[PDB]
Amino acid sequence: HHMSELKIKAAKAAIAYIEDDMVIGVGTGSTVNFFIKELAAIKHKIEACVASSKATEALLRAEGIPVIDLNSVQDLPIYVDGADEVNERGEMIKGGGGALTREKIVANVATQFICIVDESKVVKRLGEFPVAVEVIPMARSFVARQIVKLGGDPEYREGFVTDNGNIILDVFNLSFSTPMALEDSLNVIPGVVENGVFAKRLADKVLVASASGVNNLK
Amino acid sequence: HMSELKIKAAKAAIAYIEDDMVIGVGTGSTVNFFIKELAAIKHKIEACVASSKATEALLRAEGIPVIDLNSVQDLPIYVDGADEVNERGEMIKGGGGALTREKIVANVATQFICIVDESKVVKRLGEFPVAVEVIPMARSFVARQIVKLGGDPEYREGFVTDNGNIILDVFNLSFSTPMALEDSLNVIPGVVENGVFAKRLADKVLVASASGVNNLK
Numbered sequence: 001h002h003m004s005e006l007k008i009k010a011a012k013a014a015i016a017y018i019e020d021d022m023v024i025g026v027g028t029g030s031t032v033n034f035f036i037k038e039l040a041a042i043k044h045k046i047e048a049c050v051a052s053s054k055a056t057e058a059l060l061r062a063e064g065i066p067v068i069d070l071n072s073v074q075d076l077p078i079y080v081d082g083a084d085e086v087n088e089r090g091e092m093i094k095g096g097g098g099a100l101t102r103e104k105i106v107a108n109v110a111t112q113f114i115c116i117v118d119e120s121k122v123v124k125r126l127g128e129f130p131v132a133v134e135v136i137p138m139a140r141s142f143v144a145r146q147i148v149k150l151g152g153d154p155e156y157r158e159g160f161v162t163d164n165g166n167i168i169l170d171v172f173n174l175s176f177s178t179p180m181a182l183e184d185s186l187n188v189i190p191g192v193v194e195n196g197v198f199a200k201r202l203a204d205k206v207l208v209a210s211a212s213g214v215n216n217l218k
Numbered sequence: 219h220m221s222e223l224k225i226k227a228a229k230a231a232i233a234y235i236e237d238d239m240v241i242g243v244g245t246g247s248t249v250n251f252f253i254k255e256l257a258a259i260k261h262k263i264e265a266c267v268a269s270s271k272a273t274e275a276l277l278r279a280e281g282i283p284v285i286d287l288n289s290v291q292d293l294p295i296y297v298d299g300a301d302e303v304n305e306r307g308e309m310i311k312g313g314g315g316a317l318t319r320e321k322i323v324a325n326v327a328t329q330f331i332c333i334v335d336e337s338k339v340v341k342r343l344g345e346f347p348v349a350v351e352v353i354p355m356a357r358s359f360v361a362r363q364i365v366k367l368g369g370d371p372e373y374r375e376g377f378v379t380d381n382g383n384i385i386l387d388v389f390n391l392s393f394s395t396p397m398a399l400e401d402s403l404n405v406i407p408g409v410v411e412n413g414v415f416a417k418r419l420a421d422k423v424l425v426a427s428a429s430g431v432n433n434l435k
C-alpha cells in the first residue's frame with residue numbers, strides 16, 4: 001500500500017463531510033493536496049475555499065476552485081487539514097510544512113476541524129516530532145534563548161521563510177505534560193508569532209487511513 | 219512647548235550612555251530628539267540597535283552605526299518613549315506602530331530608560347488605546363476575540379507595520395491586571411504582539427516638565 005493510497009483514502013473520507021454550498025477551509029501539505037484533488041470533482045457543489053497557505057491557494061486556483069479571504073468570512077463550517085502528530089484526544093503537532101500560523105487562524109474560525117492522516121501520524125503521546133515556532137526574524141536569537149529556558153532545543157530551519165515573512169525554529173524536547181499551558185508559554189514570548197502545538201483548538205474528527213480502511217479515531 | 223520638554227528628557231537619557239556601549243533605540247518623536255543627541259556623542263558609541271525601520275533610517279542618516287539584534291548578546295541600555303507610563307514603569311506603547319520590535323529589543327536590553335514629557339504620566343493605564351499587531355488575514359477573527367475581552371478594536375486604516383502586519387487600536391480594555399491582559403492578547407491566534415508593557419517594565423522613567431527632568435522611577 002502506497003503512502004499515497006492511504007492519504008487518498010483519508011482525503012476521500014473527509015469529502016463525505018462536505019455539504020452543498022459550504023465555504024471550506026483548506027489546510028496544507030501532501031495529504032491535504034490529495035483532498036484538493038477530491039474537492040475539484042465537487043467544486044460546483046461548494047461556494048468557496050479559505051486557504052491556509054499561498055501554496056494551498058495556488059493549488060486551489062489551479063483547480064478552478066474559488067478562493068476567498070478569511071476576513072470576508074464569519075461562518076466557516078469545516079476546516080480540513082493534516083497533522084504531523086495527532087492523538088485520540090485530537091491534540092496535534094503541526095507546522096512541519098511551515099504553515100502553522102495561518103493554519104491555526106483558519107482552524108479557529110472554523111466550526112468543525114477535520115484532521116486527515118495516514119496511520120503513521122497517530123501517536124499515544126505527543127512530543128517526538130518537533131514543534132515549529134514562527135519567529136520575527138530580528139528576534140531569532142532572543143526567542144531561542146527563551147525557548148532553551150523552557151527546556152526546548154531550537155533548530156533554525158535554514159533558508160526557509162514563512163508565508164508571513166518570518167523564520168521557523170523547530171523545537172525538540174519540550175514537555176507535553178500540560179500542552180495548553182505549553183502552547184501559551186511559547187506564544188507569550190516577545191517575537192513568537194505562533195507555534196505548532198494544537199492543544200487549545202483540537203481536531204473535532206480524526207480520520208485515520210490504513211490498509212483496512214479509514215477509521216474515525218475521533 | 220512639548221518639543222522643549224521632549225528635548226530635556228532626551229538629554230537626561232544621554233547621561234546614562236557609557237563608552238563602548240551598544241545602545242538600543244526606540245521609536246517616536248521623543249526618541250527622535252534623543253537620536254539628535256546621540257549624534258553629538260557618536261565618538262562614544264559602539265553601535266545602535268534599531269526598534270523600527272524609521273529609527274534605523276534616522277540613525278544611519280546621522281552616521282551612527284547600526285547592528286542587527288541577532289548579533290548582540292550584551293545590550294546594556296534601551297532608550298524609548300511611551301504613550302502612557304506610570305510610576306511603576308508599566309507603559310502603553312505602539313502609538314507609532316512599532317511596538318513589536320520595541321518589545322523584542324526592550325526584552326534583550328539590561329536597562330530600559332523611558333523618556334517622556336509630563337503629559338505621558340498617568341496614575342492608571344488605559345485611556346490611550348492598546349495597539350495590537352495582527353496577521354492581516356486574521357483581522358476580523360482577532361477583532362471578534364478582542365471584543366470578547368471587553369475591548370473595542372479599531373482598524374488603523376492604511377497602516378502597515380515594519381513586519382507587514384496591520385494594527386487594531388483597542389479601546390476600553392480593563393487594566394486591573396495588566397500582565398494577564400498582555401498575555402490574554404498575545405495568546406489569540408493571529409496576534410503578533412500588543413502595546414501593553416507590563417511584563418517588561420521601564421527601569422528608569424525620566425519625566426520632563428517645566429521645572430526640569432524628574433526620575434519618576
Ligand SMILES: O=C(CO)[C@H](O)[C@H](O)COP(=O)(O)O
Nearest residue numbers: 246247248299312313314316
Ligand atoms: O511606542 C511607540 C511607537 O511604537 C512610541 O515610543 C510611543 O508612541 C511614544 O512616541 P512619542 O514620543 O512620539 O509620543
Ligand SMILES: O=C[C@H](O)[C@H](O)[C@H](O)COP(=O)(O)O
Nearest residue numbers: 029030031082094095097099
Ligand atoms: O504546516 C504544515 C501542516 O501542519 C501540515 O498539515 C502537516 O505538516 C501535515 O503534512 P503532510 O500531510 O504532508 O504529512
Ligand code: NA
Nearest residue numbers: 187188189192
Ligand atoms: Na509573542
Ligand code: NA
Nearest residue numbers: 404405406409
Ligand atoms: Na498569538
